[PDB]
Structures are given as C-alpha cells and as structure tokens.
C-alpha cells in the first residue's frame, strides 16, 4: 500500500486539475467582474425581515377579513330565509328547477364560459347543487331544501361582485346538497358526502377528548368484530387533529388496544396505529361493563397527559346487555361532565334497555348499526348532537374556524375552508324558540387557494434559499417549499419539513402561542433534492397574525438580507439565434397576466418574445420581474459572447451553462441543448441552491439507471455560486456550470491508479457518497449511484470513523400501495482533510487512506481491492426507503407542545338534551 505522502500528492494534483479546469471553463471570474463592473443597471435594496413579516401578516389578515365577512353574510341571509319558510309539501304543481352537476344531457344547459382563476368551465348565471349518489333525488325531504336554498344564489352573486377574488362558496346541509356558486360540472362511481368532510366537521362541533371502548366478548365473535373494526376505523377517520382520542378494549377487564396508555392526538400516525391495533383485536371472555367504564373514567380524568380541557366523551362500541351500572356512573359522573354515546352494532336479539339508558342519563345518544352502509350516516350524527351547547351559545358560536390545508374536491390545488353553522334561532323578544333549533341546518364555507396566499408572498425578491412559512397553534405548517401534494388533508409539522434541533423546537414552542421576535442560529440545512445536506446560518423573524390563530415567519440566510433591482434584449431571446447564443430556457413565472406559463419553454419562448416585442409600455403588466429578467438575459449573453465564444470546443468540457436569478440559461453548443434535463425555473433546480450555500465547488452526480441515456453523453455537472461585494455587503446572484466528458476524466485518471488489474481501488466520491470516478472500468459504466450500493463496508467504516454524519428526515408524501419515506443524506461533519485507518472484517485487513479535495466537496479513497478478501455486512442504500418512521409509542409520552382553543361550549345549564 503506497505511502500517505504519495496519496496526498496525487490528491493535490487531481484537485488542482479539476479546480483549475472548472474555474477556467465555467468563467466565474468574468461573470463576477461584469457584475462588479457595471454598478449602474442594478440597485441593491434592503430586505427587512420584520417589516416584510408584518406586511404579510396584515395582508393575510385582510384576506381573511374578506372570507369571514362573506361567510357571516351568507349565513345571516340563510337564517333569515329558512326562518320565514312555508315548508311547502305538495311540490307537484310547483316544479322546482335547479342545475344539478355530474348529470348528463341525455333526455339548464349553460354556455359554460371559461374564465381565469378557474381551470374549467364555470357559469356565474346559476348555482350548482351536488347531491350524494346514494341519497334520493326530488322528494319531500330534498325539494324543500332545494327551494329554500334558491335565495342563496343572490347572496353568492353579491359576494362575488363585491369581491372578484373569491374562489369558492358552498353550503352543506343535514342531507348533503352542496350548493356551490360558480356552477361547474363535477369530476366526470364517485363518493362524496358533504357531511363527511373536515370542513363540515370542524364547524359542526367542538374540540373533544373522545374515548373509545369496544365490547370484545367471545360470544359476539364473528362478523360483528369486522363491523366494529370498520366502524371504529371510520370514527378515527372522522377525528380531526384538534381532538384527542384513545381506544381501549374490555373483557372482564379493560386494557389498551394499542401501545398508547392515554389520550393521544388524532393525527395521521396515531390514527393509523389505532386502526392497526383494532384490526389486530380478537374476542375472548365475558363482558363486565363496570370496570371498563371505571377505567375509561380515570382515563377521562387523566390530567397527567396533554389534553384540550374541552368536550370529554365516551364512545362505547357494544351490542346489548342487562347491566346499567348506575353506581359506576354516579361515583365518577355526578355533575355529569362526560357524555356517553352507546352503539348497538350488528343484527341480534339482546336487550337494549341499559344501552339506551347509558346515553339517556349521560347526555349522550344511542345508535344502531344493522349492516354495512349506515356507518357513514350514523357517524355524522353525534357531532350534531354535540352542537347543542354550541347552538345554545347564541352570539358566541358566531366565530369562523379556518381548516388546515387539504386537497380541493374539483382539483383546484391546495386550499383551506372557512366554517360557520346555521341555526333556526328567531324572535328573541318572544322566545317561542328553545325547540328543534337544537339541530343545525348544516354549515357553509368559502375557500382560499394556497396560490392566493402565495400571491401575497413575494418569494422572487428573495434568494432561492429564503422562503415563507406560517404555522397554526396545533403546530403544522400552512405554507412551506417542501409542502407538496401527493395526488385527505396534507399535514406537515414545522419539524417535519426542515431538520430538527433544540432552537427550532424552542421557536416552534415560542411563537405557536403567538409571540414575536428574532433569532439567528447556526445549524445545518437541506437541499432541494433529497440527496445532499448542507450547513449555514439562518435567521428567523416571526410575528403573530392578530386576526386569526395562525402565526407567520420568514427566513433569511445571511446573504439574502439584501437583494437586487433594476433602474427603470430582443435578439438574445430568439430561437433562430441559438446557433451562436446557445439553447436558451426562460423560467415560466407569472411575468405577465396576459400570457400563461407553457412549460414547453420553446413555445413559452415564442410567446414571451412576441409579447415583449409588441408601444412596449404594456399598460397592464408587471414591472420589476420583467426588468430583472431582461437584465439577467443581457448578462448571460454578455458572458457567452465574451468568453465562451473564444473556446468553441474543449476536449474535456462537453458543455457549459449558467443559470441565474431571473430564469435565463445558456448552453453554448447546439448539441448540448437536448442534453439539458432540468427545470427551467431557476428557483426549483437543486444545484442552484446547493452551490449558493456551499462556499466550495459542487459536483452534482448524474442519476443512475435513469430512463433515457443521460450519463455517457451528458457528462458530470460542476457548479460554483457567484458571490459579489458591492460596498462590502454580500449577495449571491448566479451560479455557473460545466459538463465534463467521462472519457476525458477516465483517460486523465489513468496517469498512479492504472486499470485492467484487480489489486487496489481508486474512487472519488462527493458529499452523499455518490460515485464520480473509478478505475475498474466496470464501475465507470455505473457512474452516479450511491457508493454504498457497490462498496457498503467502506462507507460504513467511514461513517463509524466519523467522516460521514447522516441524519434522517421523514417525508409523509409518497406514492405507495400514505407511507413514510426515510430520507437519508450524508455530509462531512469533521473538518479534517486527512483520514487513515485499517478496514478489517476479520483476519483479512485492508489499509486505506482517504484525503479530501481542497475547495470542493470531493473525497478520494485509496483502498485495496475487494478481491483480496470478500466482505459484505449488508447492502447500504441511500434512497427513498419505504419504512415505518419514528415509533409513536415513544413520542406520545413527550409530544410536541400544543396550545388549544380557548373557545368551548359545553355543560350549558339551559341545554335540554331530552334524548
Ligand atoms: C329549523 O329547522 C327545522 C327543520 O325542518 C324546522 O322544523 C320544521 O318545523 C315546521 C314547523 O311548521 C314543521 O312543519 C316541519 O315538519 C319541521 N321539519 C321536520 C323535519 O319535521 C324548524 O321549524 C326550524 N325552526 C324554525 C324557527 O322555523
Ligand atoms: C377584502 O375586502 C376589501 C373590501 O371590499 C376588498 O377591496 C379587498 O380587495 C379584499 N381583499 C383583500 C386582500 O384585502
Ligand atoms: C317555494 O315554495 C313557495 C311556496 O311557499 C313557492 O311560491 C315558490 O315559488 C317555491 N320556489 C321556487 C323556486 O319555485
Ligand atoms: C443531524 O446530524 C447531527 C450529526 O450527525 C446529529 O447530531 C443530529 O442529531 C442530527 N439531527 C437530527 C434532527 O437528527
Ligand atoms: C412547443 O410547442 C411548439 C409548437 O409548434 C413545438 O414545435 C415544440 O416542439 C414544443 N416544445 C416542447 C418542449 O413542448
């Protein structure tokens, strides 16, 4: 094995060659020199974090003022209209006419004029009614609703006309009947119950400490167990994240069905765990209600755990019996703080008297489930039963509640919904009320798209590493870069998108209560692509949103504290000029409302240049965005004309490129244009951000086993961010790039580590353990894969000796047959350039010396061949591994710190609760 000095000399020579070639061919010096030479065409302006967060908070509060005023208006007029309703029965003569969606033209037929802000056909003349497929059409229980909701369309018209930015307006009733205003055909045996939706549920009840008990007696084993499992699973589905639920089973003794021994939050992971636990249940023993309910009661009074002190409930899943257990209820529940809802599931002939008495005495309700199908309807009922204190609150239940981000029904994007319920309370001066008013007519809601929220968020004046994020008092994120749809509400915690520490949890527990401040901390950050980790200083500025429960914050790496502007060409952005200017891509952003994104990019180029070409004033068009993009295109053209033209063809350099802020890309030769595979949006490509954060050269490895050839003829991507100093103040405008022919690198790698023999291994890796160069001539075919997938022993020993530190993220968005993805990414932790040791699997030992490449992220390892002694502990894989995330059995006993809503309505003295 060669000496350490020889390996150091080889590393120095290789790193000098690579660095020099990348620097000379990419042309960082010329670009930065141009940027520092003009100082005229651009303006550097401060990006005030606290000011921006305040402006965004007030703006979003105003948009919520819009969408709450609309809702109070619609609800008030709904109450007024139904209050003075005849309840016409004989609708034979009075044929009511309405526009039913999802219908067919086989014997209203609107022209269906398509407008912006909606992807599909809309008609503002009429409103569209959605009814569940299972429920029946025109009858004595739907036609009345279809009549008295015919006056809601006027309010819809008025609301839209007074505010043209409204997205959607819906009203949900006790029998479905979603009447949504911008009448659009439905999806295209579709299942959608309006009452079975988070926005319906969150408005129709209060945050509840639900408990579940299941009758698991051996005598009722069979189909009843399956019905119980499916019913309780659908119950858990009904539970939102504002409620705490736990399931226990009792058979002469009560025990937890799962690893949880207390009330846990009803989030997706816990809900799945409870569902799986109940699905694993089996029936054995004799029933004893007393000890079951007792246990449920100290679980209710279990104040040692996290709870929303609000709306305590028991939900018993029984069949029938002759045991009322008066004394058990009397001992624990004398003031009657706990509701008890009991079920009679299955078809049997047991006595149901005590079962009904339990609900009757404890202010709960009793339900029967004779067969599959009635579970969906029966589940909605207890929520409306819980609304009795809420309906009797009067001028206190009038408070809109904003849902979390969830996918819209007609495929519009990420949206949240407002909620308000409608009552029949009327005539306060006489009070013929205190009646049927107990029940609600349903809930009505408006929608705001996350595109609308992000229109209030100007991200393009920041760096790609900066962004916005807002968090609700539960703890999840309302808006985040990593918040991406999968196709169910999307749920990302603040410490589930970013990387966890003590400072981030401290600030997520310091602004979730609704405080403000600033804090700069030194941590490690994550790249756009799930392959690399990085490190940098980020400052977080946060302020509460006074109008709502939300809390927004802003992030700034300490080089995007300032930004760039432009004070106050055509030939550059011409496809026919690509022969000399290179195959340009333009970033499909909202440059102008007149044009649209194309993704095509070629067409987008035609549209962009035809709009820019023709007076060029553009009276209804953006100003700063187009100005910056023009200036940046000028810069890219200047670079290509001055430097890249001089050396038309380099043996080792397959291509060159420069991506910038503004969205202009330049690949010098024509043939390399079709080799370009990445996103034209410069805020979306990973390497842009990675290079800005790393102060060294960044070698992006190509993908391995990717569809279509992209390794041999594409080359190796190298980058280095451009940093400028105007008046001693930092900014990171652009990054440059090169494609390195693999053949040239191979031929120059044979100068030391000669090939065609199996004696020693010479491989060059980067951050993340991706193979870039190898001598074996069979590893060089497979360039671009994770190095642990070919030599896992070496990577594991490298991890143990602490040259590669990894921490795993858990991303909950995946395509699987809502799996959790284990996101492993590696990086250098110990800033030690030299590393040596012996890799021994037993008697056989291999001497290795690993020396890092200076001013890059590459590592060269000089280890013996695998033929000397076989050793493979396990094939270590770095990819999106499908596996269970962190165990919730341990994270519920020390969960994330929550703040609950102070607004609750329960234990009302005026409450009737006759049933
Ligand atoms: C609030 O809603 C209920 C639901 O319809 C109304 O109950 C109806 O009351 C009328 C009174 O004449 C009866 O004719 C109907 O038969 C009732 N409905 C049902 C389903 O039986 C109630 O009247 C409403 N409250 C007010 C103040 O009108
Ligand atoms: C909110 O309401 C006002 C009053 O009509 C309206 O002009 C405004 O555009 C709405 N939206 C926002 C974001 O303020
Ligand atoms: C609803 O019923 C009333 C009778 O109270 C009738 O006059 C009215 O026209 C009906 N509405 C529609 C849309 O026809
Ligand atoms: C990130 O990696 C460091 C070093 O390996 C480790 O100390 C830290 O706990 C990791 N962070 C997370 C959130 O796992
Ligand atoms: C864009 O549309 C034009 C229309 O003629 C077509 O020629 C071109 O190939 C398209 N490019 C892409 C990438 O879709």
Q: Comparing C-alpha atoms, which of 657, 674, 640, 664 is closest to residue 738?
A: 657
Cα gap 879→604, rounded to integer Å: 34
Ligand 5 centroid, distance to 605 Cα (angstroms): 10
Q: In terms of domains, do 414 and 471 share one?
A: no
Task: Kindly give, in sequence order, each residue whose CB lies less than 8 Å from that of residue 127, ignoring residues fewer than 6 positions away.
Answer: 99, 152, 153, 156, 179, 180, 181, 183
Q: In terms of domains, do 703 and 779 share one?
A: no
Tell me if 668 sits within 8 A of 640, measured CB to CB: yes
Task: Determine, yes or no, domain membership for 31.
Answer: yes
State both tokens at 459: 């991200």
Task: Determine, yes or no, domain membership for 4.
Answer: no
Q: Comparing C-alpha atoms, which of 373, 381, 132 is closest to residue 230?
A: 373
Task: Specify the residue with its C-alpha closest to ligand 5, atom 14.
Answer: 600
Cα gap 34→54, rounded to integer Å: 36
Q: In terms of domains, do 666 and 682 share one?
A: yes
- Helix, strand, or coil (residue 520): strand
Ligand lying closest to the C-alpha of residue 81: 1
CATH label of the domain that carries residue 94: 3.30.450.20
Q: In terms of domains, do 498 and 414 share one?
A: no
> Among all chains, which residue has been given the structure tokens 């009814």?
131
Q: Which of 807, 811, 822, 825 to mutate to test the pocket of ligand 4 (most atoms within 8 A of CB)?
A: 807
Q: Residue 428 to residues 74, 394, 647, 909: CA-CA distances in angstroms? A: 21, 10, 87, 18
Q: In terms of domains, do 757 and 883 share one?
A: yes
Task: Determine, yes or no, domain membership for 909.
Answer: no
Cα gap 560→665, rounded to integer Å: 22
Task: Specify the residue with its C-alpha closest to ligand 1, atom 3.
Answer: 436
Cα gap 282→279, rounded to integer Å: 9
Task: Determine, yes or no, domain membership for 898.
Answer: no
Ligand 4 centroid, distance to 522 Cα (angstroms): 13
Cα gap 667→672, rounded to integer Å: 7
Name the resolution in angstroms. 3.2
Task: Specify the residue with its C-alpha closest to ligand 1, atom 27.
Answer: 424
Q: In terms of domains, do 33 and 114 share one?
A: no
Task: Determine, yes or no, domain membership for 638.
Answer: yes
Ligand 1 centroid, distance to 424 Cα (angstroms): 9
Cα gap 490→419, rounded to integer Å: 18
758 Cβ closer than 6 Å to some ligand 2 atom = no
Task: Specify the residue with its C-alpha closest to ligand 3, atom 10.
Answer: 147
Cα gap 711→716, rounded to integer Å: 8
62 Cβ closer than 6 Å to some ligand 2 atom = yes
Q: In terms of domains, do 500 and 420 share one?
A: no
Domain stops at, among 372, 403, 424: 372
Q: In terms of domains, do 115 and 160 share one?
A: yes
Angle, helices 28-38/624-639, rounded to nearest 10 degrees: 130
Task: Determine, yes or no, domain membership for 650.
Answer: yes
- Helix, strand, or coil (residue 316): strand
Backbone angles phi, psi at 537, to 5 degrees: -95, 125
What does the CA dihedral 580, 582, 583, 584 come to, rounded to 10 degrees?
-110
Task: Determine, yes or no, domain membership for 541.
Answer: yes
Ligand 4 centroid, distance to 490 Cα (angstroms): 26
Ligand lying closest to the C-alpha of residue 599: 5
Q: In terms of domains, do 707 and 610 share one?
A: yes
Cα gap 793→778, rounded to integer Å: 19
Task: Determine, yes or no, domain membership for 358.
Answer: yes
Ligand 3 centroid, distance to 527 Cα (angstroms): 61
Q: Comparing C-alpha atoms, which of 523, 476, 468, 474 is closest to residue 500?
A: 523
- Closest ligand 2 atom number to CA of residue 162: 5
* Way it was determined: cryo-EM
Cα gap 22→17, rounded to integer Å: 9
830 Cβ closer than 6 Å to some ligand 5 atom = no
Task: Kindly give, in sequence order, each residue whose CB lies less than 8 Å from that of residue 218, ignoring residues fewer than 6 positions away.
Answer: 251, 283, 284, 285, 286
Q: Which of 805, 806, 829 to mutate to test the pocket of ligand 4 (most atoms within 8 A of CB)?
A: 805
Tell me if 471 sits within 8 A of 511, measured CB to CB: yes
Give me the number of domains the chain comprises.
5
Cα gap 798→878, rounded to integer Å: 15
- Closest ligand 1 atom number to CA of residue 141: 20
> Among all chains, which residue has been given the structure tokens 């990006």?
47
- Helix, strand, or coil (residue 770): strand
Tell me if 521 sits within 8 A of 503, measured CB to CB: yes
Q: In terms of domains, do 782 and 868 share one?
A: yes
Pairing of strands 339-345, 366-369: parallel
Q: In terms of domains, do 399 and 517 share one?
A: no
Task: Specify the residue with its C-alpha closest to ligand 3, atom 1.
Answer: 147
Cα gap 764→770, rounded to integer Å: 9
Cα gap 14→11, rounded to integer Å: 5
Task: Specify the residue with its C-alpha closest to ligand 5, atom 13.
Answer: 600
- Helix, strand, or coil (residue 1): coil
Q: Write out the H or E segment, with its range, that includes residue 692.
A: helix 686-693
Ligand 3 centroid, distance to 94 Cα (angstroms): 7
Binding residues for a divalent metal cation are 215, 217, 219
Ligand 5 centroid, distance to 671 Cα (angstroms): 17
Q: Which of 82, 87, 94, 146 to mutate to test the pocket of ligand 3 (most atoms within 8 A of CB)?
A: 94
Q: In terms of domains, do 581 and 545 share one?
A: no
Ligand 2 centroid, distance to 442 Cα (angstroms): 27
Q: Which domain holds residue 69?
A: 55-202+392-450
């Amino acid at each position: 094995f060669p000496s350490a000095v020889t390996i150091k000399s080889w590393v120095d020579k290789m790193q000098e060659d690579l660095v020099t070639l990348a620097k000379t061919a990419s042309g960082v010096n010329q670009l930065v020199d141009i940027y520092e030479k003009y100082q005229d065409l651009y303006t550097v302006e401060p990006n005030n974090a606290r000011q921006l967060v305040e402006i965004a908070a007030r703006d979003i509060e105003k948009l919520l003022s819009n969408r709450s005023k609309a809702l109070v208006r619609l609800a008030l007029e709904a109450e007024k209209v139904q209050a003075a309703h005849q309840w016409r029965e004989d609708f034979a003569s009075n044929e009511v006419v309405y526009y039913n969606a999802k219908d067919d033209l086989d014997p209203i037929k609107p022209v269906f004029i398509e407008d912006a802000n909606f992807g599909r056909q809309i008609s503002y003349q009429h409103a569209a009614v959605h009814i569940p497929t299972d429920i029946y059409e025109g009858s004595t229980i739907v036609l009345n609703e279809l009549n008295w909701t015919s006056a809601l369309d006027e309010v819809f018209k008025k609301n839209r006309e007074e505010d043209p930015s409204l997205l959607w307006q819906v009203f949900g009733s006790a029998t479905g009947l979603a009447r949504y205003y911008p009448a659009s055909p439905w999806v295209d045996i579709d299942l959608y119950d309006v009452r079975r939706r988070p926005w319906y549920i969150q408005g129709a009840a209060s945050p509840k400490d639900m408990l579940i008990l299941v009758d698991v007696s051996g005598s009722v084993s069979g189909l009843t167990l399956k019905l119980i499992r499916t019913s309780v699973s659908e119950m858990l589905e009904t539970l939102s994240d504002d409620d705490f639920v736990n399931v226990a089973s009792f058979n002469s003794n009560a025990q937890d069905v799962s690893c949880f021994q207390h009330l846990v939050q009803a989030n997706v992971r816990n809900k799945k765990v409870l569902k799986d636990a109940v699905n694993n249940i089996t029936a054995k023993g004799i029933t004893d209600y007393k000890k079951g309910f007792s246990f449920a009661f100290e679980q209710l009074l279990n104040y040692n755990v996290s709870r929303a002190n609000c709306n305590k409930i028991i939900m018993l899943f029984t069949d029938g019996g002759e045991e009322r257990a008066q004394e058990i209820f009397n001992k624990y529940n004398k003031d009657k703080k706990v509701r008890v809802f009991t079920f009679s599931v299955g078809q049997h002939n047991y006595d149901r008297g005590p079962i009904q008495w339990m609900a009757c005495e404890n202010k709960g309700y009793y339900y029967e489930i004779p067969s599959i199908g009635a579970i969906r309807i029966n589940t909605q009922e207890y929520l409306d039963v819980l609304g009795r204190p809420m309906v009797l609150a009067g001028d206190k239940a009038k408070q809109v509640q904003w849902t979390n981000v969830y996918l819209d029904a007609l495929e519009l994007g990420l949206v949240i919904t407002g909620t308000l319920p409608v009552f029949n309370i009327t005539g306060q001066f006489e009070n013929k009320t205190n009646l049927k008013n107990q029940l609600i007519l349903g809930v009505m809601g408006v929608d705001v798209s996350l595109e609308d929220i992000k229109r209030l968020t100007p991200r393009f004046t920041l760096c790609p590493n900066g962004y916005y994020f807002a968090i609700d008092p539960n703890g999840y994120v309302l808006l985040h870069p990593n918040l991406q749809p999968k196709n169910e509400p999307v749920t990302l915690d603040f410490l589930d998108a970013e990387l966890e520490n003590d400072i981030k949890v401290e600030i997520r527990n310091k602004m979730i209560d609704g405080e403000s401040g600033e804090k700069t901390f030194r941590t490690l950050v994550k790249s756009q692509d799930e392959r690399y980790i990085d490190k940098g200083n980020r400052t977080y500025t946060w302020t509460p949103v006074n109008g709502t429960d939300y809390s927004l914050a802003l992030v700034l790496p300490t080089y995007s504290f300032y930004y760039i502007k432009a004070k106050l060409d055509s030939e550059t952005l011409k496809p026919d000029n690509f022969e000399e200017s290179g195959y340009t891509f333009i970033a499909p952003r909202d440059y102008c409302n007149d044009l649209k994104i194309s993704d095509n990019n070629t067409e987008f180029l035609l549209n962009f240049n035809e709009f820019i070409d023709r007076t060029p004033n553009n009276p209804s068009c953006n100003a700063d965005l187009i100005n910056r993009v023009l200036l940046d295109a000028g810069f890219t053209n200047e670079l290509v004309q001055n430097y890249w033209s001089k050396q038309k063809n380099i043996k080792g350099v397959k291509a060159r490129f420069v991506v910038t802020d503004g969205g202009i890309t330049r690949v010098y030769p024509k043939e390399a244009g079709e080799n370009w595979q990445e996103n034209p949006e410069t805020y979306e490509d990973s390497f842009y951000k990675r290079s800005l954060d790393n102060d060294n050269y960044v070698f992006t490895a190509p993908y391995f086993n990717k569809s279509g050839p992209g390794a041999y003829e594409s080359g190796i991507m190298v980058s280095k961010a451009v940093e400028i100093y105007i008046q001693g103040k930092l900014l990171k405008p652009a990054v440059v790039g090169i494609k390195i022919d693999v053949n040239s690198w191979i031929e120059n790698f044979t100068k030391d580590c000669k090939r065609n023999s199996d004696v020693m291994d010479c491989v060059i890796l980067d951050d993340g353990g991706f193979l870039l160069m190898a001598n074996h001539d069979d590893y060089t075919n497979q360039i671009g894969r994770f190095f642990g997938e070919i030599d896992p022993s070496l990577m594991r020993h490298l991890v143990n000796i602490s040259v590669y530190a990894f921490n795993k993220s858990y991303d909950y968005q995946s395509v699987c047959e809502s799996c959790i993805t284990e996101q492993t990414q590696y990086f250098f932790d110990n800033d030690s350039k030299s590393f040596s040791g012996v890799l021994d699997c037993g008697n056989c030992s291999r001497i290795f010396h690993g020396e890092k490449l200076m001013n890059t992220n590459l590592i060269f390892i000089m280890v013996e061949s695998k033929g000397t002694c076989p050793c493979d502990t396990r094939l270590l894989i770095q990819a999106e591994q499908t596996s269970d995330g962190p165990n919730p059995c341990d994270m519920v006993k020390q969960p994330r710190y929550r703040k609950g809503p102070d607004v609750c309505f329960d234990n009302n003295v005026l409450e009737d609760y006759t049933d």
